[PDB]
């Protein structure tokens, strides 16, 4: 699996959607309409098309300065 972050229309998206394609919900932001999700690699394509789903972005890494 890989970690991604999905930006959604809340009142158009429902978290239970993701389990169908192999996903699990990690964290639902309270202040932005977005959701951290673990999905299999082959399933990112499927996530992209779900209702309420405006964007899928990969989880990136910071560098310690």
């Amino acid at each position: 699996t890989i970690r991604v972050i999905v930006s959604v229309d809340k009142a158009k998206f429902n978290p239970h959607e993701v389990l169908g394609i192999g996903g699990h919900i990690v964290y639902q932001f309270k202040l932005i309409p977005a959701v951290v999700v673990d999905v299999p690699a082959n399933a990112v394509g499927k996530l992209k098309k779900m209702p309420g789903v405006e964007k899928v972005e990969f989880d990136h890494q910071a560098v310690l300065p």
Partner: protein, 320 residues
């Protein structure tokens, strides 16, 4: 453990913090500074009284457990001690040595961090310990004494990616009236890493004890600050000297804490955050710009940004 007698690191004295203390040391009750880093040595004798909240967002799971919030690296404790080390008989002293700190651990034992965790960290800084951004619904978050949101978010961290949900969260912090400060990065690169590169965030470069920009400092910062040979607190209940734009950042975050503390002590409200452009005395960032020690070529430049922050002038300008 044998605590040495207090000293004032050359960086503290460069950013002109000590003359501000008679006005405020930053211990104005509405003011907190959230430090998103590796955590904190929460029991350090030169830090503990100032640690108002200790929390972790590692792996997308918010924890208020102390064991999960503790610094397993050192980088967090060092940063926090630059902002807030207690003014007393031991150790070192911070730029704002009475300010309340929220240590938000978004980086692990290795200092590694996922953007998802950092974003949750920003979220927790806004929500504060009570889980609610704006409890009374008035639109005032930073500076509302009825809320517990931080007034400063300090991020001594950065990366190459620019992601829309991270930016959305930064936007939320900006609109909550929070001043956001972040390390330019240490690649000797042409421009700052994110989130330091966002217009809403203050990018910070590192100078050395001779006032030259450090060769590692990512260029085109907004301001600059002591970032070479910086002595601060370090685990466990001890001190250490480090370099990097990670050590410059907290000097700037401390100065912003002094400014908003002073301004609220006098007026009962905080200043607006401001923009990168600002050259007025009406916002935090304009004040920071017009009072910085312009080094290098005249005005804003690719090495020093607007210059080395100077707290004593910035506060005098805020209060004038």
């Amino acid at each position: 453990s044998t605590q040495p007698a207090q000293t004032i690191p050359w960086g503290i004295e460069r950013v002109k913090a000590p003359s501000v203390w008679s006005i405020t040391d930053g211990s104005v009750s509405v003011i907190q500074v959230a430090v998103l880093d590796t955590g904190v040595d929460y029991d350090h004798p030169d830090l503990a009284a100032n640690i108002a909240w200790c929390v972790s967002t590692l792996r997308g799971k918010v924890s208020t457990k102390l064991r999960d919030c503790a610094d397993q690296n050192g980088h967090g404790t060092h940063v926090i001690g630059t902002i807030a080390a207690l003014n007393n008989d031991i150790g070192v002293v911070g730029v704002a040595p009475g300010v309340q700190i929220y240590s938000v651990r978004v980086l692990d034992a290795r200092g590694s961090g996922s953007y998802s965790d950092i974003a949750i960290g920003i979220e927790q800084a806004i929500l504060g310990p009570d889980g609610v951004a704006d409890k009374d619904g008035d639109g005032i978050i930073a500076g509302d004494p009825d809320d517990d949101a931080a007034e400063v978010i300090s991020m001594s961290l950065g990366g190459p990616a620019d992601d829309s949900y991270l930016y959305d969260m930064i936007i939320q912090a900006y609109n909550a009236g929070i001043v956001i400060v972040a390390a330019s990065g240490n690649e000797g690169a042409p421009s700052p890493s994110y989130p330091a590169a966002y217009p809403e965030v203050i990018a910070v470069g590192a100078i050395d004890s001779n006032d030259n920009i450090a060769s590692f400092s990512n260029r085109q910062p907004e301001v600059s600050a002591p970032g070479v040979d910086i002595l601060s607190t370090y685990p466990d209940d001890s001190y250490e000297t480090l370099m990097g734009t990670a050590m410059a950042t907290p000097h700037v975050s401390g100065v912003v804490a002094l400014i908003q503390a002073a301004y609220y002590q006098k007026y009962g409200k905080i200043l607006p955050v401001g923009t990168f452009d600002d050259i007025s005395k009406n916002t935090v960032r304009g004040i920071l710009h017009i009072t910085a020690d312009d080094l290098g070529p005249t005005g804003w430049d690719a090495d020093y940004g607007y210059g080395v922050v100077r707290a004593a002038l910035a506060v005098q300008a805020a209060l004038g």
